[PDB]
């Protein structure tokens, strides 16, 4: 299955060049998936559409008589039919059932599935065409399975492109390898998200029977973004094409722009060996940060007392307080709790109190009121969190606790933090608020009462905390993962944000006690102490190099053979060790018999 | 809200053991707090019991803390009971309560707004005193 | 306690008459931050855990009977319960959206005059 499925790539079209361009073409070779169908191995399915596709059958009287092409072709969202009535093709854009066996072949009234269209059943018509004599064109040429009806189909910026061509045969059930270009036919602009279709064969069994006809052969080979050149002659015409991936000389070929090559070595990419893996590591586990204090006190601050801090160059236990099964409740206003475990910020504010039950509805960061404004309100401009858990065990009183007071109003007190923490008559906007004379009021009620009580008084002490993130340094961070240790390989890495690609080596390279990693001459680094192992490794590049082509003249022979510039032959392929042939589509553009020499493998 | 069941009718004899069973999903047991079921079926299973199935978080008050205690049955994402000293309280209805719609964008057990009586109700089950 | 409880137990509207479900409450229902008020109506038989079904008590919500909600007012409240033999009679009370305890009670029964 090869030289099928070339197209002239748009309108634009010129005379007598060779044109190198990149698009979504069938590359050579490829192996089709050819649909032999004969009665009993019979059916209709499904296919996934993927990047576009090359599509063939063996035909001559719209025995595929059509395709749906959508999501679903079935259910809820729009889905795009192209039918062939017995002269033309019929368009729409409408979300079909399709159940079965697609027989939903209702047709309007002016030359019923003949001229005027098909397909009526369903309920989105937002687009219909009608051509002229597209199925008669098919219908020509002389008898059923001689003839290839040859298709591209691909969808991009919310058009699909059709393209087709139409040629003779000799074998029904095959699919020669002839060169030939189809021309554009549509670009419809119908804007469906395709990524399934199927052929409609609509219930037919032909009356060429060649095999009583429950029966055909079609082709379905999956287009792949690759270069390919084209050859126009002086009249327009695509004439030759070559696949620039396919092999050394077609990848040579392609690079000197032209379709022959004189005796010599030719220099055409560069080879540099990918990374196998990643090795990421960190020193010894030190600097928690001192979350005991505003967590896990004994008995927690009163709503007033509130005990608060900022905190730095440490590392957040936070994943194991996320994990925890002991708090009541906690919701986090800035980014998720979930990724909080493992993140890095500059540094965190945090404090803690008490609440009763039903008062820790109005404590958090993003949501603000006569509670919480006059005893502790953060400012909503950090990654602020919130976290509950019982007083009603602990520190309440069966009374309630009259040292655990309700929160102190002072509603003149409009500042963030400051949100009068105070315990102190001074509820109004602006009266003198001394000590209790007749100018001022002091709310002053019970919070901390215990277990017994109904579920909303039963009280909580709370924890409040606040990340910061700026562009500079990340002082605290979740804790990190350090991997195994990989020597011998081009790998990624990560010591202490020493980032890069490289082979890492046991190394002699002696240095002193206070050095981490060595620079070299070009000042490039190229050792580092492990920070776990306090191993002295040694890293040097993974390999890389210039790639050429050594050939006869193509004017004598089309074999050829490659030199890997500079690189050690064990660094290259995973090769099959014949003389001539190099099995190259798969393997690394080459993949053969080795040798070594000083100028490379 | 959840994907919601409730079954596990049984007779709680006076001073035993309790046992109920339940399926759940997503915010209701998870964001906001699921209900035990709570109140005997001659009338709505009050969630005197409040749960997270996603991470063994409870409140409770003091009979429903032992006659509706509540585990996590991990296999339906969801409340089984584990209840002690049986009575007309452990009578209650063999229900699950898929928390109040998520108060906001929040993370975590978040539900210090939002109520543990139902988005979406498992449809219950029975039960009495085993005297 | 915030597990709201229902005033009657069972209702008592005749054929098609405008009886009430009498309900009450915990503390500051009508909150400060919040505004819209945390009781809403439950609506759904016994033996089912207690369902939300009037938001914010004013009016039945969603899949509520119609004639079986209506006024919250903070710590109490009193809803429709119209010809509730039937309709209103999927049984009911106000119930609390407010925080991790918030529920309703056990809910008036269906019951109308005889």
């Known amino acids: 299955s090869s030289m099928r499925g070339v197209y002239y790539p748009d309108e634009i079209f010129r005379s007598d060049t060779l044109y190198l361009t990149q698009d979504l073409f069938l590359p050579f070779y490829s192996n089709v998936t050819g649909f032999h169908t004969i009665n009993h191995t019979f059916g209709n399915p499904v296919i996934p559409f993927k990047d576009g596709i090359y599509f063939a059958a063996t035909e001559k009287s719209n025995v595929v008589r059509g395709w749906v092409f959508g999501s679903t072709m079935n259910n809820k969202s729009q889905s795009v039919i192209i039918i062939n009535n017995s002269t033309n093709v019929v368009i729409r854009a409408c979300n079909f059932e399709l159940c079965d066996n697609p027989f939903f072949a209702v047709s309007k009234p002016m030359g019923t599935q003949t001229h005027t269209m098909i397909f009526d059943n369903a309920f989105n018509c937002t687009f219909e065409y009608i051509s002229d004599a597209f199925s008669l064109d098919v219908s020509e040429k002389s008898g059923n399975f001689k003839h290839l009806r040859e298709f591209v189909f691909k969808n991009k910026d919310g058009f699909l492109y059709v393209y087709k061509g139409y040629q003779p045969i000799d074998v029904v059930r095959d699919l020669p390898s002839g060169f030939n270009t189809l021309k554009p036919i549509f670009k419809l602009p119908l804007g469906i998200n395709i990524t399934n279709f199927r052929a409609i064969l609509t219930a037919f069994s032909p009356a060429q029977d060649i095999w009583g006809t429950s029966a055909a052969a079609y082709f379905v080979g999956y287009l792949k973004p690759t270069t390919f050149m084209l050859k126009y002659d002086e009249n327009g015409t695509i004439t030759d094409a070559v696949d620039c991936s396919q092999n050394p000389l077609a990848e040579l070929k392609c690079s000197v722009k032209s379709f022959e090559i004189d005796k010599g070595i030719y220099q055409t990419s560069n080879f540099r060996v990918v990374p196998s893996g990643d090795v990421v590591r960190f020193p010894n586990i030190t600097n928690l940060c001192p979350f005991g204090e505003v967590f896990n006190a004994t008995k927690f601050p009163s709503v007033y007392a509130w005990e608060r801090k900022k905190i730095s160059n440490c590392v957040a236990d936070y994943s194991v307080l996320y994990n925890s099964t002991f708090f009541s409740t906690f919701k986090c206003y800035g980014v998720s709790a979930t990724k909080l475990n493992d993140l890095c910020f500059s540094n965190v504010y945090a404090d803690s109190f008490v609440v009763k039950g039903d008062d820790v509805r109005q404590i958090a960061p993003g949501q603000t009121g006569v509670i919480a404004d006059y005893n502790y309100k953060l400012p909503d401009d950090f990654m602020g969190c919130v976290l509950a858990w019982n007083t009603r065990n602990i520190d309440a009183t069966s009374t309630g606790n009259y040292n655990y007071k309700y929160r102190y109003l002072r509603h003149g007190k409009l500042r963030p933090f400051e949100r009068d923490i105070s315990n102190v008559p001074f509820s109004p906007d602006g009266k003198p608020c001394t000590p209790p004379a007749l100018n001022c009021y002091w709310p002053l009620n019970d919070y901390g009462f215990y277990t017994t009580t109904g579920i909303g008084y039963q009280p909580y002490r709370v924890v409040v905390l606040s990340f910061e993130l700026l562009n500079a340094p990340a002082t605290v961070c979740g804790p990190k993962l350090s991997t195994d240790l990989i020597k011998n390989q081009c790998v990624n890495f990560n010591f202490n944000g020493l980032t890069g690609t490289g082979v890492l080596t046991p190394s002699s390279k002696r240095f002193q006690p206070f050095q981490q990693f060595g620079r070299d001459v070009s000042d490039f680094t190229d050792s580092v102490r492990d920070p776990k192992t306090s191993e002295i490794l040694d890293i040097s590049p993974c390999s890389f190099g210039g790639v050429s082509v050594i050939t006869p003249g193509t004017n004598a022979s089309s074999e050829v053979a490659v030199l890997y510039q500079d690189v050690n032959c064990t660094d290259v392929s995973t090769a099959i060790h014949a003389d001539q042939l190099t099995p190259a589509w798969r393997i690394y553009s080459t993949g053969n018999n080795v040798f070594q020499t000083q100028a490379g493998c | 809200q959840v994907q919601l069941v409730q079954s596990g009718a049984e007779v709680k004899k006076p001073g035993a053991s309790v046992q109920v069973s339940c399926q759940a999903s997503?915010?209701?047991?998870?964001?906001?707090?699921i209900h035990w079921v709570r109140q005997a079926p001659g009338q709505g299973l009050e969630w005197m019991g409040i749960?997270?199935?996603?991470?063994?978080?409870?409140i409770y008050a003091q009979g429903f803390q032992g006659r509706v205690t509540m585990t996590r049955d991990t296999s339906l994402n969801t409340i089984y009971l584990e209840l002690s000293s049986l009575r007309s309280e452990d009578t209650a209805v063999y229900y699950c309560?898929?928390?109040?719609?998520?108060?906001?964008?929040?993370?975590?057990?978040?539900?210090?707004?939002?109520?543990?009586?139902?988005?979406?109700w498992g449809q219950g089950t029975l039960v009495t005193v085993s005297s | 306690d915030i597990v709201m409880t229902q005033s009657p137990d069972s209702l008592a509207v005749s054929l098609g008459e405008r009886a009430t479900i009498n309900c009450r409450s915990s503390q500051s229902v009508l909150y400060s931050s919040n505004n819209e008020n945390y009781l809403a109506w439950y609506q759904q038989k016994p033996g089912q855990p207690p369902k939300l079904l009037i938001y914010?008590?004013?009016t039945r919500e969603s899949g509520i009977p119609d004639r079986f909600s209506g006024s919250g007012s903070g710590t109490d409240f009193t809803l429709t319960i119209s010809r509730l033999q039937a309709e209103d009679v999927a049984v009911y009370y106000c119930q609390q959206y407010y925080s991790l305890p918030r529920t309703f009670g056990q809910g008036t029964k269906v019951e109308i005059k005889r």
């Open positions: 749960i997270y199935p996603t991470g063994g978080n409870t």
């Open positions: 997503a915010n209701t047991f998870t964001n906001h707090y």
């Open positions: 914010w008590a004013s």
């Open positions: 309560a898929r928390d109040v719609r998520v108060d906001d964008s929040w993370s975590g057990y978040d539900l210090l707004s939002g109520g543990t009586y139902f988005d979406y």
